[PDB]
Short mmCIF file of C-alpha atoms in Angstrom, two decimals:
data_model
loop_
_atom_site.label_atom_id
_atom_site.label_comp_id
_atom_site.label_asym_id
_atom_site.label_seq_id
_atom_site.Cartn_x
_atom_site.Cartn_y
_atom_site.Cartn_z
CA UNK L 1 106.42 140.31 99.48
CA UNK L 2 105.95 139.94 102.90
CA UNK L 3 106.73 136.69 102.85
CA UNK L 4 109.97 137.16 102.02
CA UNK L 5 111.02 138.29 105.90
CA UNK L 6 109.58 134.75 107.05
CA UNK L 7 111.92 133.10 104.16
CA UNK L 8 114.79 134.57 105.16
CA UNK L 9 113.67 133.93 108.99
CA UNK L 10 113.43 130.52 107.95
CA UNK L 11 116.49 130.29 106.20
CA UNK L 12 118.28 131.12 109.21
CA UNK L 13 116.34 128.35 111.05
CA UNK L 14 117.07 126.06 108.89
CA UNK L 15 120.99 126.88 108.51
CA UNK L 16 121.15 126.91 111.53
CA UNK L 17 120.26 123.44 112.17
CA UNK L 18 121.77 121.85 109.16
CA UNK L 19 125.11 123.32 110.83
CA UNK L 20 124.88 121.77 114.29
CA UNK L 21 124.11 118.76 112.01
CA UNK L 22 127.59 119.47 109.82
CA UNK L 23 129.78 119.84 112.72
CA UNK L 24 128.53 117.14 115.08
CA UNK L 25 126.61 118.95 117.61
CA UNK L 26 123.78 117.07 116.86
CA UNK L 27 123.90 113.23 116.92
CA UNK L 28 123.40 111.28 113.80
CA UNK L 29 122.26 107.64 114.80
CA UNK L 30 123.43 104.14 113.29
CA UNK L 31 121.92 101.30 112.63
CA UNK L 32 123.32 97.92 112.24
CA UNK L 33 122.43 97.26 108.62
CA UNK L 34 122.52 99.18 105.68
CA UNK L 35 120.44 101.96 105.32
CA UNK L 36 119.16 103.49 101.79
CA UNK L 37 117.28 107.27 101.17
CA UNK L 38 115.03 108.55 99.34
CA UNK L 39 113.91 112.51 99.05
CA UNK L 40 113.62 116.02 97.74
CA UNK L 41 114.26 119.48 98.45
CA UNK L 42 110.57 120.92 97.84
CA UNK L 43 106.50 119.62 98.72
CA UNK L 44 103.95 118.88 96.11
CA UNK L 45 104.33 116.60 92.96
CA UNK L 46 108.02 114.99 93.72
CA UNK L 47 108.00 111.77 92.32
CA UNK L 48 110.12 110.15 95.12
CA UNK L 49 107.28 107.61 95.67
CA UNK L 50 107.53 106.05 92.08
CA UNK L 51 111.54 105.80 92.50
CA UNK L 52 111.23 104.02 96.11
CA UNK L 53 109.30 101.20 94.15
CA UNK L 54 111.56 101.42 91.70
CA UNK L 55 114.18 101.16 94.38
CA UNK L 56 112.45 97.47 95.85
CA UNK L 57 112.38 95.82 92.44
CA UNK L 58 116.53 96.13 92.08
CA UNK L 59 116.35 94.35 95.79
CA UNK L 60 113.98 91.85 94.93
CA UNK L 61 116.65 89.06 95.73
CA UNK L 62 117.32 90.42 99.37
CA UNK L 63 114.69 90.93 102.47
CA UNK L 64 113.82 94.77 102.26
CA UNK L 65 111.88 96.89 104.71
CA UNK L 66 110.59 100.06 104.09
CA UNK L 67 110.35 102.70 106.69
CA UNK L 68 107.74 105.13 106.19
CA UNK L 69 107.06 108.58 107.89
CA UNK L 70 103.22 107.70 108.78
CA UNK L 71 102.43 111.12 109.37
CA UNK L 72 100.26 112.66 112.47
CA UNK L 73 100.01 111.53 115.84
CA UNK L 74 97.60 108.46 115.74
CA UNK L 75 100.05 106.08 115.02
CA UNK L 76 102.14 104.56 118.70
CA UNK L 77 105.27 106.25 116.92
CA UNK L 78 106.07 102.64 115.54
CA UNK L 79 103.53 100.56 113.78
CA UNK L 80 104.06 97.71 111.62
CA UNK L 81 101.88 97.82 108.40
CA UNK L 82 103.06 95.42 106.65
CA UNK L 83 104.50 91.70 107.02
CA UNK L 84 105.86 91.51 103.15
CA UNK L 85 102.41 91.78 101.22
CA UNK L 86 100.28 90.90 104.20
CA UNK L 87 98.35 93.92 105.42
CA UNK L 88 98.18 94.26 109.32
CA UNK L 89 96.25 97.33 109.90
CA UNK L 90 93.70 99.31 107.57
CA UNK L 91 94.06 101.73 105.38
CA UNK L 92 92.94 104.26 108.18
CA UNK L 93 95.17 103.59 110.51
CA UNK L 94 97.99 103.04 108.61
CA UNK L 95 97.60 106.03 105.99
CA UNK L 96 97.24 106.14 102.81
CA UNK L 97 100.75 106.61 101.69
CA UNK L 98 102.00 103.41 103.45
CA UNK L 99 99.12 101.32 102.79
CA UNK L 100 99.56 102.25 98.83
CA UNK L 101 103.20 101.31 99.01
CA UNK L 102 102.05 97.89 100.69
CA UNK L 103 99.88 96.72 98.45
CA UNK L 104 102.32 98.07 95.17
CA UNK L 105 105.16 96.08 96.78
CA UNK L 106 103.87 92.50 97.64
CA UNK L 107 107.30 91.44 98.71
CA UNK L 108 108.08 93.98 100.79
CA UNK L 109 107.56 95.21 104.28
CA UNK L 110 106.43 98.52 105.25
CA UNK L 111 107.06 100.31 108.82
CA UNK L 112 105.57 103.62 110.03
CA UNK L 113 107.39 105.62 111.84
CA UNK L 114 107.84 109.37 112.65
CA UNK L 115 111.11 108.26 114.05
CA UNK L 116 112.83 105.86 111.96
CA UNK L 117 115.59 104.39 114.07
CA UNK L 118 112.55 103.19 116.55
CA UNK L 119 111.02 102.06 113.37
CA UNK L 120 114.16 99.99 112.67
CA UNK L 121 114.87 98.36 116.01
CA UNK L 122 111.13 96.43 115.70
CA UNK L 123 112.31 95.80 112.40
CA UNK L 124 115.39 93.87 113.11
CA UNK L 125 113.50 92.25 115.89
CA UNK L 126 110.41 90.79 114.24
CA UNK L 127 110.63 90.83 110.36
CA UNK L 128 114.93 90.52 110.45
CA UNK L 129 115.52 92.36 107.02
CA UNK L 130 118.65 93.33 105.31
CA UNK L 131 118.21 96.50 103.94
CA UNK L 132 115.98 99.94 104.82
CA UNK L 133 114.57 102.14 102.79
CA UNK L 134 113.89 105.83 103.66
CA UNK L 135 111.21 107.59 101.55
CA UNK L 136 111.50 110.90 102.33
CA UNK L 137 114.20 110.86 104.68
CA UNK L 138 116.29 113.46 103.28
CA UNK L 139 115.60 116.24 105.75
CA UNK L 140 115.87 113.51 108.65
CA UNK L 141 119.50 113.48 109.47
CA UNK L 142 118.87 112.10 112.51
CA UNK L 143 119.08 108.71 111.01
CA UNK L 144 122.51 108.19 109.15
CA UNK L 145 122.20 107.34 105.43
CA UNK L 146 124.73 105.02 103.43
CA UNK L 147 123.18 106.05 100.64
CA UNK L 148 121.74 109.34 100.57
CA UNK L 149 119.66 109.71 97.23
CA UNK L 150 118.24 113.19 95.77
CA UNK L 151 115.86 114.17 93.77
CA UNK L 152 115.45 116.96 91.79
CA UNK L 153 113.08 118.39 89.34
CA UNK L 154 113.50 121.58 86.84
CA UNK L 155 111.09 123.49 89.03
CA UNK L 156 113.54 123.28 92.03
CA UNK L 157 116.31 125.18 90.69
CA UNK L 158 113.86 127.68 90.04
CA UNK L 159 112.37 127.80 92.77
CA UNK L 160 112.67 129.47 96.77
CA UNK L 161 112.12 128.71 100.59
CA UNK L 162 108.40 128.71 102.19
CA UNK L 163 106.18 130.11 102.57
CA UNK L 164 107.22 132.13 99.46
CA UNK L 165 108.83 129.54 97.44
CA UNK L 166 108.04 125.47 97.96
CA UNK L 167 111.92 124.51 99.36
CA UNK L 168 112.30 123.28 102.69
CA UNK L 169 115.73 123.89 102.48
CA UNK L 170 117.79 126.01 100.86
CA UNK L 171 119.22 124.36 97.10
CA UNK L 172 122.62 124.75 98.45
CA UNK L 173 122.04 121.65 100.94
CA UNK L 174 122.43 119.60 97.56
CA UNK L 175 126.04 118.88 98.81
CA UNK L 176 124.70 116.33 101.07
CA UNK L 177 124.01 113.85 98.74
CA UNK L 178 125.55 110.99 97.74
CA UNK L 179 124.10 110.28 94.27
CA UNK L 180 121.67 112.78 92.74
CA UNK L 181 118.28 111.79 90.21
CA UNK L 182 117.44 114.16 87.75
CA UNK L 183 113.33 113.98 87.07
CA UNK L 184 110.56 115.09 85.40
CA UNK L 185 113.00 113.91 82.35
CA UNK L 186 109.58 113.34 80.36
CA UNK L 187 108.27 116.45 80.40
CA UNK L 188 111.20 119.13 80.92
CA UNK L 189 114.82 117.69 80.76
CA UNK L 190 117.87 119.02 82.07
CA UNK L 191 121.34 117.93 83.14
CA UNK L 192 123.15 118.82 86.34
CA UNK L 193 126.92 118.86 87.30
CA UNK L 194 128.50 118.09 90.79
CA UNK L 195 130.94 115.46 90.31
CA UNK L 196 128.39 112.77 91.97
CA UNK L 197 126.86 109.94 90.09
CA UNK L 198 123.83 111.50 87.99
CA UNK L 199 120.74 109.71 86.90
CA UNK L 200 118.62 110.80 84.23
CA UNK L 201 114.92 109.89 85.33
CA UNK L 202 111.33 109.17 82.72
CA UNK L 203 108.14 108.27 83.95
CA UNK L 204 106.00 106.96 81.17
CA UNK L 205 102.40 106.13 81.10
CA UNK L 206 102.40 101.72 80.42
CA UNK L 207 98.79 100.82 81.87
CA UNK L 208 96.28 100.71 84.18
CA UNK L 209 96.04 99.54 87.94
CA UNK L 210 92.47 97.88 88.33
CA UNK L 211 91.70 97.83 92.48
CA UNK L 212 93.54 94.49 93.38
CA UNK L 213 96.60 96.45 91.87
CA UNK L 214 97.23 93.93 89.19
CA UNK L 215 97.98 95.77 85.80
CA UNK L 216 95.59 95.58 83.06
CA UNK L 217 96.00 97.29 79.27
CA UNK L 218 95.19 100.57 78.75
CA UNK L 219 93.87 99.79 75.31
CA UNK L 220 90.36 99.47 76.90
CA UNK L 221 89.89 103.04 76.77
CA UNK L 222 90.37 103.60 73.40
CA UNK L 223 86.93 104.48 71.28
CA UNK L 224 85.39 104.99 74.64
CA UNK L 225 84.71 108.06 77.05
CA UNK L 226 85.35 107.85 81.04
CA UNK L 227 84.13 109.31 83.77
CA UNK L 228 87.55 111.05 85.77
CA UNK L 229 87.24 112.21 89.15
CA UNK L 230 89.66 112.89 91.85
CA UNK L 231 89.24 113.25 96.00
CA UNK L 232 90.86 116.63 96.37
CA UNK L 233 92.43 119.63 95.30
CA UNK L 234 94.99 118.01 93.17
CA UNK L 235 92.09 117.86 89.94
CA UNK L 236 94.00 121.14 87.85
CA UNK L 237 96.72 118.51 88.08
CA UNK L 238 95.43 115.72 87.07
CA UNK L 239 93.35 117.18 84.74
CA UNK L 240 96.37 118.29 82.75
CA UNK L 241 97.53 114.62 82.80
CA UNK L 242 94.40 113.30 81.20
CA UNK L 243 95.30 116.32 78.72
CA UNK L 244 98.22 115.47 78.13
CA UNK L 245 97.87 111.56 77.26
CA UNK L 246 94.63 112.25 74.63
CA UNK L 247 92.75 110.24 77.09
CA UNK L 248 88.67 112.01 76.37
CA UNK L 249 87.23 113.07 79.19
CA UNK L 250 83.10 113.58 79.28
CA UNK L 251 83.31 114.58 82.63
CA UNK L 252 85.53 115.54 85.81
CA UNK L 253 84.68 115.23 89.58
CA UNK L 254 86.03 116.75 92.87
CA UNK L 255 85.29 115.66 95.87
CA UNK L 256 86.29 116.79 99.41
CA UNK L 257 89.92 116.13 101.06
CA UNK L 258 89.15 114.08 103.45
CA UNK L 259 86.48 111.84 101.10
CA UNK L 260 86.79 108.46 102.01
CA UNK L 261 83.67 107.32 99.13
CA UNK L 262 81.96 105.94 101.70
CA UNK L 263 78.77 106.20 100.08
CA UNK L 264 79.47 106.31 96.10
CA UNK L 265 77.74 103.61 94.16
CA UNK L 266 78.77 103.38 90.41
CA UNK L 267 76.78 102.95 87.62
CA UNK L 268 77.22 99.57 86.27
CA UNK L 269 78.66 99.66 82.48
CA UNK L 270 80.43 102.49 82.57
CA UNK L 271 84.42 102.61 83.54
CA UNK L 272 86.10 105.12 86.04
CA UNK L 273 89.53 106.62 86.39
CA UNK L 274 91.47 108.07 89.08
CA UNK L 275 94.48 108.41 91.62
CA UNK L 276 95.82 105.56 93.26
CA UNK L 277 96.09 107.51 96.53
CA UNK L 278 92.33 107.24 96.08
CA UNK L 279 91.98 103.50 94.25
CA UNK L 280 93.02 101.73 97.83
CA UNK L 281 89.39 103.06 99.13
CA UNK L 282 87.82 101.62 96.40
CA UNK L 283 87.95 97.92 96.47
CA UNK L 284 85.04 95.77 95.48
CA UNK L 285 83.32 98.11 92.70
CA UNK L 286 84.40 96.50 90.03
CA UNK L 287 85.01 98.70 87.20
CA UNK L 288 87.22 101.61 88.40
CA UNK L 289 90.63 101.71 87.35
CA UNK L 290 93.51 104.25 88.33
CA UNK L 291 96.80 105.36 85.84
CA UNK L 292 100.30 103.79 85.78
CA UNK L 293 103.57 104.67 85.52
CA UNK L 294 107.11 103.49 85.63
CA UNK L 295 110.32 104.54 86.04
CA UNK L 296 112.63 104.25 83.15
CA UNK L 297 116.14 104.84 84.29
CA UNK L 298 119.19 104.94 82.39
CA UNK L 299 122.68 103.16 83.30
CA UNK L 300 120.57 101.00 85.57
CA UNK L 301 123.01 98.35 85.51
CA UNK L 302 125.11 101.59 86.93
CA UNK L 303 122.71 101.81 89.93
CA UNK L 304 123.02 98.73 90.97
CA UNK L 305 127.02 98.74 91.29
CA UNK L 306 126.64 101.50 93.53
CA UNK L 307 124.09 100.14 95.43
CA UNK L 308 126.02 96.57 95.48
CA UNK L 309 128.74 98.00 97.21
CA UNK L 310 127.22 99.38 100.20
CA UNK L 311 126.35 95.62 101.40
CA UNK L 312 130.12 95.11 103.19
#
């Protein structure tokens, strides 16, 4: 309960900003090309990841950069990470969220940047793309948005401002998008009314990603146990997951945050599951695999119109 102050401190904060931000106090930078986003209102399990992949395969026929958030402070500000498939950096340099999105979108760049209008000028300079992508670029209004994409899950609605709740910003800030995408259809569906273009959003499970990402059946587990384990505190999640798609499970492992399985060595014979925010650490021993999903989106042909517009 005495978190609740802090919230409402924090709502006042974040108001606060958001108006300087509504009335033009506060600039709100453009860039010469189109620019896409991608976000959500709360932290933990979003699912904004799996539609900015989604997002790349609809603009397979144009030159796409992504530009990533790279968090902390050992980056320059700007780093290129990837030259469309071609890795420049390693994994710990770059991060593991932008390394992952490199290597699950071979024909696509990927900058990191904490600021992204840096991030585009050495984009537009070197690699000379068409199109940005912001993944997780709702909250940064710094950087104006053509198309300013939301998502939202069940749980939002529901839900309140840190440190109580998990918002970052208050639900009423939903008014600043442009088209909204309505997730976690798979598990608990809902609809939503604003007037915008709506989405409804699935994720299903369709196979496995084997460590050169390169998607293999996931009959192989069938009539045979695995060995699960996952590198932090996300296991009661994942667990359920496992649960929930009858995979059988003889054993679960945890393993520190910051685990970077420098020393593991796997039993040969025997196959391995587990997050592919851990998989990328994991090339060379060659039987662990990592789950796959994919975004199954209705009225795509919809999407596209709206996105094909934006391009004059």
């Amino acid at each position: 309960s005495s978190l609740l102050p802090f919230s409402y401190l924090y709502e006042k904060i974040i108001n606060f900003r958001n108006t300087l931000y509504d009335k033009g106090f506060l600039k709100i930078k453009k860039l010469p090309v189109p620019v896409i986003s991608v976000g959500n209102l709360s932290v933990g399990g979003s699912g904004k990841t799996s539609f900015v992949m989604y997002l790349a395969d609809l603009l397979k026929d144009k030159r796409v950069c992504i530009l990533s958030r790279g968090y902390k402070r050992k980056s320059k500000g700007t780093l290129i990470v990837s030259e469309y498939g071609n890795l420049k950096v390693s994994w710990e340099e770059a991060g593991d969220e932008p390394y992952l999105m490199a290597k699950l979108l071979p024909h696509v760049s990927v900058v990191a940047s904490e600021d992204r209008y840096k991030g585009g000028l050495l984009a537009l300079e070197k690699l000379s793309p068409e199109v940005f992508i912001l993944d997780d670029g709702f909250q940064h209004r710094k950087l104006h948005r053509d198309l300013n994409i939301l998502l939202l899950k069940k749980k939002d609605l529901k839900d309140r401002l840190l440190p109580a709740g998990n918002l970052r910003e208050p639900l009423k800030e939903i008014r600043r998008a442009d088209a909204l995408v309505l997730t976690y259809q798979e598990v608990e569906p809902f609809e939503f009314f604003t007037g915008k273009p709506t989405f409804k959003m699935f994720r299903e499970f369709c196979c496995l990603l084997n460590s050169d990402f390169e998607e293999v059946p996931f009959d192989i587990l069938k009539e045979r146990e695995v060995i699960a384990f996952s590198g932090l505190g996300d296991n009661g999640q994942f667990r359920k997951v496992l649960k929930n798609l009858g995979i059988k499970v003889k054993e679960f492992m945890s393993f520190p945050d910051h685990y970077d399985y420098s020393d593991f060595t796997p039993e040969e014979g025997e196959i391995y599951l587990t997050t592919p925010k851990d998989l990328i650490k994991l090339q060379g021993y060659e039987n662990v695999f990592a789950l796959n999903f994919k975004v199954k989106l209705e009225r795509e042909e919809k999407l596209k119109k709206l996105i094909y517009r934006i391009f004059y």
